[PDB]
Paper text:
Although the crystal packing differs in various crystal forms, we found a similar dimeric structure in all crystals, indicating the non-randomness of GLTP–SF homodimerization. In crystal form 3, the four molecules comprising the asymmetric unit form two dimers similar to the original C2 dimer. To further assess the intrinsic nature of these variations, two dimers belonging to the same crystal were analyzed for changes in dimer openness. Even within the same complex, 12:0-monoSF–wtGLTP, the θ angle and t distance vary significantly in the different crystal forms (68.2–80.2° and 15.4–19.5 Å, respectively), reflecting changes in dimer openness. In class 2 crystals, N is 2, 4 or 1, indicating the potential structural distinctions between monomers which are not related by crystallographic symmetry.
Human glycolipid transfer protein (hsGLTP) forms the prototypical GLTP fold and is characterized by a broad transfer selectivity for glycosphingolipids (GSLs). To elucidate the structural dynamics of the GLTP–GSL dimer and associated adaptations, we comparatively analyzed nine novel crystal structures of wild-type GLTP (wtGLTP) and the sulfatide-specific mutants D48V and A47D/D48V complexed with N-lauroyl-containing monosulfatide (N-lauroyl-3-O-sulfo-galactosylceramide; hereafter referred to as 12:0 monoSF) and disulfatide (N-lauroyl-3,6-di-O-sulfo-galactosylceramide; hereafter referred to as 12:0 diSF) in different crystal forms and compared them with previously studied GLTP–24:1 monoSF complexes.
Numbering used by the authors:
A (entry chain A): 1 to 209
B (entry chain B): 3 to 209
The structure:
C-alpha cells in the first residue's frame, strides 16, 4: 500500500475535465487495495483492475496530447473506431475501471461512515455487499454473482483489513480512517464526473459477464 | 491443436528435459479458451504463470536445470527452510495438478463418460477431473467457486468443435486424435508426480 493521503487525486476544475496523465498515475496506486483483503481469491480482481489501467496508459502513451483528458479518449476513439465504439480500446477499459473505482469508493466510504452489521461489527461483509451492489452487481450474470457471494467469505476482519492498509506507518485505526476520508474527497468527485461523461457521451454499455 | 504438439516419449531413466517440456506444455493454456467463457480466464492465467516462473528459472542457467529433477535438486540446496514452497518447484507442483486436470478431463470424454440425463453436458467430466487433481488443495470457499464456475462449461458438441477448429474432422476423429496425445501426456505427468513423492517435494496446503 502506497499511502493514499500521499497520492491524492487532483481537484475538479470549473469545466470538469480530467487529465488522463495524472489520473492514471494516481489510480495506479489503488490495485494493491485488493492485497489488503488478505486472500488469493481477490487476485483475479487486482489483475483485472490493473489490466484496465495498463490499457488506458498504453493508449495514452501513443499520443499524450490528443488523449490529454478522459473526454478526449472517448471523442478520439469514437473517430478511430466509428460504429464499434464504445465497446473498444480505452473507452471500454475505463468503462469497467470506473466500476471498480466506485467499488473501492463506496466500500471505503462505508467503513469511514461507521456502517456495520451491529450483530457482527468486526466483519466487512455488509460494506462489501453494498459496494458490489451499487458498483458491479448489475453487470454480472448468475455465475459471477454466485462467485461473488462465495468470495465474500474469505473477506478479512475489519480490524485486520484496516491494519493491512496502515502498514508502513505507526498509525491508529482512527487516524488511518482520517487519511482515507481525505483521499475519498476528490476521488468520489472524479468518479462521479466519469460516470456523467459516460452518460453524456452515450459511452455506457449494459452487457453482463 | 493439442493433437500435433505431442510430448516426447520418456527415456528409460525417466528424466524429463526442462526445455522441451516447456515447449510442449506452452501450447496447452488455450485449452481453457475452448471453454468459451471469461470465467476461465483466471484459470488460464494461473497455469501460464506456473509455466513462466519455470521458464524463467530455467533461463538463468539452462545447463544447471537441464532436467526437472535437476530443478528440484538445486532449489533444495538453495533454500532449505522455504523449499519446497519456493521457486519453480512450487510452480511445477501446481502446474502438474492443472496438467492432471486437463489429462483426466479429456480421458473422461474419450472413454465416453457422460451423465445419460444430460449427455451433451460436460459437467461430470470436469467434476471428476477437479476431484482427482485439484479439489483436495482447495478450501471450501474455492470449491464453492468451482461449483459456480462449472455452470459456465460449454456443451460437449461445442467443446469438441472448439478443440477441432480448423480441421474438418468428426467428433470421433477429434477424440481419436486426443487419445494419441493422452498417451505420452499421462505418462510424463505420472513421472512428475512420482518425482515429487521421491523428493519429498509435495505440499498438501489448501488455498
Ligand atoms: C477451480 C477454481 C477455478 C474457478 C475459476 C473461477 C474464476 C471466476 C472469477 C472471475 C472474476 C474475476 C473478476 C474479473 C471479471 C471480468 O471478467 C469482468 C469484465 O471484465 C472486463 O471485460 C471486458 C470485456 O467485456 C474487457 O476485456 C476488460 O478489460 S479491458 O482492459 O480490455 O477493457 C475487462 O476488465 N470485470 C469486472 O467484473 C470488474 C472486476 C471485478 C470487480 C470486483 C470488485 C469487488 C469484489 C468484492 C470484494 C469483496
Ligand atoms: C466479482 C466477484 C469477485 C470474485 C473473484 C474471485 C476469483 C476466484 C479466484 C480463484 C480461481 C483462480 C484459480 C487459481 C487459484 C490459486 O489460488 C491456486 C494456487 O496457486 C498457486 O499459489 C502458489 C502460492 O501458494 C503460487 O503463487 C503459484 O504459482 S507460482 O508460479 O508462483 O509457483 C500459484 O499457481 N491455484 C490453482 O488452484 C489451480 C489452477 C486452476 C485450475 C482449475 C481448473 C478447473 C476449472 C474447471 C473448468 C470446468
Amino acid at each position: 500500500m502506497a499511502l493514499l493521503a500521499e497520492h491524492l487525486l487532483k481537484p475538479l476544475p470549473a469545466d470538469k475535465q480530467i487529465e488522463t496523465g495524472p489520473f492514471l498515475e494516481a489510480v495506479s496506486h489503488l490495485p494493491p487495495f485488493f492485497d489488503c483483503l488478505g486472500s488469493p481469491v481477490f487476485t483475479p480482481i487486482k489483475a483485472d483492475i490493473s489490466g484496465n489501467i495498463t490499457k488506458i496508459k498504453a493508449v495514452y502513451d501513443t499520443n499524450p496530447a490528443k488523449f490529454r483528458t478522459l473526454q478526449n479518449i472517448l471523442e478520439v476513439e469514437k473517430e478511430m473506431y466509428g460504429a464499434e465504439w464504445p465497446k473498444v480500446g480505452a473507452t471500454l477499459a475505463l468503462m469497467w475501471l470506473k466500476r471498480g473505482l466506485r467499488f473501492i469508493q463506496v466500500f471505503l466510504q462505508s467503513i469511514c461512515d461507521g456502517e456495520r452489521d451491529e450483530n457482527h461489527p468486526n466483519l466487512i461483509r455488509v460494506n462489501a455487499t453494498k459496494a458490489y451492489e451499487m458498483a458491479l452487481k448489475k453487470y454480472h450474470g448468475w455465475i459471477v454473482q454466485k462467485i461473488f457471494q462465495a468470495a465474500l467469505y474469505a473477506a478479512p476482519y475489519k480490524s485486520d483489513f484496516l491494519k493491512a492498509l496502515s502498514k508502513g506507518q505507526n498509525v491508529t485505526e482512527e487516524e488511518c480512517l482520517e487519511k482515507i476520508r481525505l483521499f475519498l474527497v476528490n476521488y468520489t468527485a472524479t468518479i462521479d464526473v466519469i460516470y456523467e461523461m459516460y452518460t453524456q457521451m452515450n459511452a455506457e454499455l449494459n452487457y453482463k459477464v
